[PDB]
């Protein structure tokens, strides 16, 4: 709190966790702040919105392997700083965009910056926290920042859009990014290239590990249900009138609150009971919630399932982010740069391929018979997390 308390104190390695939390929070606050502003910018009205979820996720998924390999030869601080340096430019571009193509360009640039920050921040919380329990706790806390950003984005953006203009939601978001950059400069040293001592396992050897494929598949499938629902919602299709401000402001509160609660509890509760158990019970809850979704008569019927699934998703993440570092320690070389590129690609594949493949399938058969398939897929994948109870060693 006090300005002097930071000057006379040992830096306690919790500043790195604070930086990661802040970077994730700002990346996810910029991601969702455009939700109240999309209907002002409008193929079908749900195809244009589908291209806004996919444009950023595709580029982030493409970029992640490169950052995973790059942190090995440069170290983490330079990519972490580049994340902020691209977030600021993305915000400035958003505030001065007057069409749809500029929206897409800003989304892609933000995707590049977000990939840098996420891969180089998750993979550094593991290099400094080599204790299993401490690593679990810190990654749960850091993943809470994602939920906090998603919670805070849309309402703050909507308030500033309705009250004090259209460029305001981004001209008060560039200042926070600047403050985050100042804090990063205070803690890190983004001016020195620090190659890692040892060369890690190749990306084509980690991908052959069954115990890494299972942990990545859990994260990939857990997000495949909510990724195909949000682009196809009634709220997008209507203008910003006739009480549509309220629907765009509070649309993503339930999932965000549930994710926050679940991840915060299970970051510390994933070791008292096995992480395999959190993932196993976090993939049946997703299945049941997705199965219950297509029984909703009106929009309110999506309030209660979108709670449960969100909570479940949190558990899975908060259980399977530390397990990647644990498995790479137990069976491979302790270099976490390229094992969290796998996690990020798995996380973002759902949003990369959702608004297109889900749309084509829903046109082929129907939405209820798509949600049913996704739910059954999740439930069927759930038992495979039993193979993470005691994996072998080197």
């Amino acid at each position, epitope marked *: 709190a006090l300005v002097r308390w930071l000057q*006379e104190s040992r*830096r*306690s390695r919790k500043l*790195i966790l604070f930086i990661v939390f802040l970077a994730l929070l700002l990346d996810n606050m910029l991601l969702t702040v455009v939700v109240p502003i999309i209907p002002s910018y409008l193929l079908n009205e749900n195809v244009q919105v589908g291209l806004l979820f996919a444009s950023k996720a595709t580029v982030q998924l493409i970029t992640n392997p490169f950052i995973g390999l790059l942190t090995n030869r440069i170290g983490y601080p330079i990519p972490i700083f580049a994340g902020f340096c691209i977030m600021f430019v993305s915000t400035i571009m958003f505030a001065f965009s007057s069409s749809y193509a500029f929206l897409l360009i800003a989304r892609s640039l933000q995707g590049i910056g977000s990939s840098c920050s996420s891969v180089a921040g998750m993979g550094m919380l593991a290099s*400094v926290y080599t204790d299993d329990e401490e690593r679990g706790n810190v990654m749960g806390i850091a993943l809470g920042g994602l939920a906090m950003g998603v919670l805070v984005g849309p309402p703050f953006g909507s308030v500033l859009y309705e009250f004090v203009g259209k460029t305001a939601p981004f001209l008060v978001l560039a200042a926070l990014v600047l403050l985050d950059g100042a804090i990063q400069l205070f*803690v*890190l*040293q983004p001016s020195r290239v620090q190659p890692e001592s040892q060369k890690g396992t190749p990306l084509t050897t980690l991908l052959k590990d069954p115990y890494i494929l299972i942990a990545a598949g859990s994260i990939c499938f857990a997000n495949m249900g909510i990724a195909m629902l949000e682009p196809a919602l009634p709220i997008w299709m209507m203008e910003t009138m006739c009480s549509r401000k309220w629907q765009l402001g509070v649309a993503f509160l339930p999932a965000s609150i549930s994710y926050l609660i679940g991840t915060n509890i299970f970051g510390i509760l994933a070791h008292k009971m096995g992480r395999w158990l959190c993932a196993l019970l976090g993939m049946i809850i997703v299945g049941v919630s997705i199965l219950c979704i297509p029984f909703a008569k009106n929009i309110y019927g999506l309030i209660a399932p979108n709670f449960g699934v969100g909570f479940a998703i949190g558990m899975v993440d908060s259980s399977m982010m530390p397990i990647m570092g644990y498995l790479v320690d137990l069976r491979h070389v302790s270099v976490y740069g390229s094992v969290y590129a796998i996690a990020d690609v798995a996380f973002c594949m759902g949003y990369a391929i959702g608004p297109s493949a889900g749309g084509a399938i829903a046109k082929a058969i129907g939405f209820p018979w798509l949600m049913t398939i996704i739910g059954i897929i999740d439930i069927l994948f759930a038992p495979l997390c039993f193979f993470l109870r005691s994996p072998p060693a080197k």
Partner: antibody, heavy 124, light 108 residues
Framework: EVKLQESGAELVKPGASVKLSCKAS????????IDWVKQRPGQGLEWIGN????????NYNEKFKNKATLTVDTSSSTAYMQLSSLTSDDSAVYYC?????????????????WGQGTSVTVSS | DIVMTQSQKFMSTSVGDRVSITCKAS??????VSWYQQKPGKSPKPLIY???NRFTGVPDRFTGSRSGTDFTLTISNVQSEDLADYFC?????????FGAGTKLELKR
């Protein structure tokens, strides 16, 4: 190479003050914290305080607030610690150490270089 | 003021034997403990930082572990060079506390 040269031994009277010195060389002096530790013969080590030579911002053990005052000399790159009203129980061995940051960050992880002790003795 | 207790101040082991030195904190210090070794007639040198990691030049024998508030330094092949004083550290709270110290001695 990093080096913290220190005095061999100091002899003081039962009422007096002594200014231990620790001369730092081999690196940029004004960017690393310098700690002082005290080891009585046959007992554990006790922290005394920190100083940051760039800002001259110091920290003290509550037990040693009224005894040891740390100060710095940037021009000659030296670190001083003054002990006041020396008596017995104040005849330990005093160490000057340098704090290091984790590579690429400013997070402290270990104290790399410790100077050789200064065997302060109190006797009339 | 967190008190780091080192129970045994003198440990006796023959060459080529496993030894383990234990330290116990009072409050909760989360892997904020470093293990230092001081050879006879020399200034201390770091061995373990953050309670698990090993310094750059420390041999492979030394391993650091934590089991809650109990920290342990294990030497696998005790050699004639590993006869020194070993002490803990803590910096979670600011008044720094070191362990009393454990001295290794030969057996005959």
């Amino acid at each position: 190479e990093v080096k913290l040269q220190e005095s061999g031994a100091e002899l003081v009277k039962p009422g007096a003050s002594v200014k231990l010195s620790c001369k730092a060389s081999g690196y940029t002096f004004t960017s690393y914290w310098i700690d002082w530790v005290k080891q009585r013969p046959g007992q554990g080590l006790e922290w005394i305080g920190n100083i940051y030579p760039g800002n001259s911002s110091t920290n003290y053990n509550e037990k040693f607030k009224n005894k040891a005052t740390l100060t710095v000399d940037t021009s000659s790159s030296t670190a001083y610690m003054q002990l006041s009203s020396l008596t017995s129980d104040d005849s330990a061995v005093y160490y000057c150490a340098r704090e290091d940051y984790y590579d690429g960050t400013y997070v402290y992880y270990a104290m790399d270089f410790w100077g050789q002790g200064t065997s302060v003795t109190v006797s009339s | 003021d967190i008190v780091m207790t080192q129970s045994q101040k003198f440990m006796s082991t023959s060459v080529g034997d496993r030894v383990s030195i234990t330290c116990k904190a009072s409050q909760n210090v989360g892997t904020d403990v470093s293990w230092y070794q001081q050879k006879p007639g020399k200034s201390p040198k770091p061995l373990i930082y953050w309670a698990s990691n090993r310094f750059t030049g420390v041999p492979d024998r030394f391993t650091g572990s934590r089991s809650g508030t109990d920290f342990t330094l294990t030497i696998s092949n005790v050699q004639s060079e590993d006869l020194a004083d070993y002490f803990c550290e803590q910096y979670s709270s600011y008044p720094l506390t070191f362990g009393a110290g454990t001295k290794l001695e030969l057996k005959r």
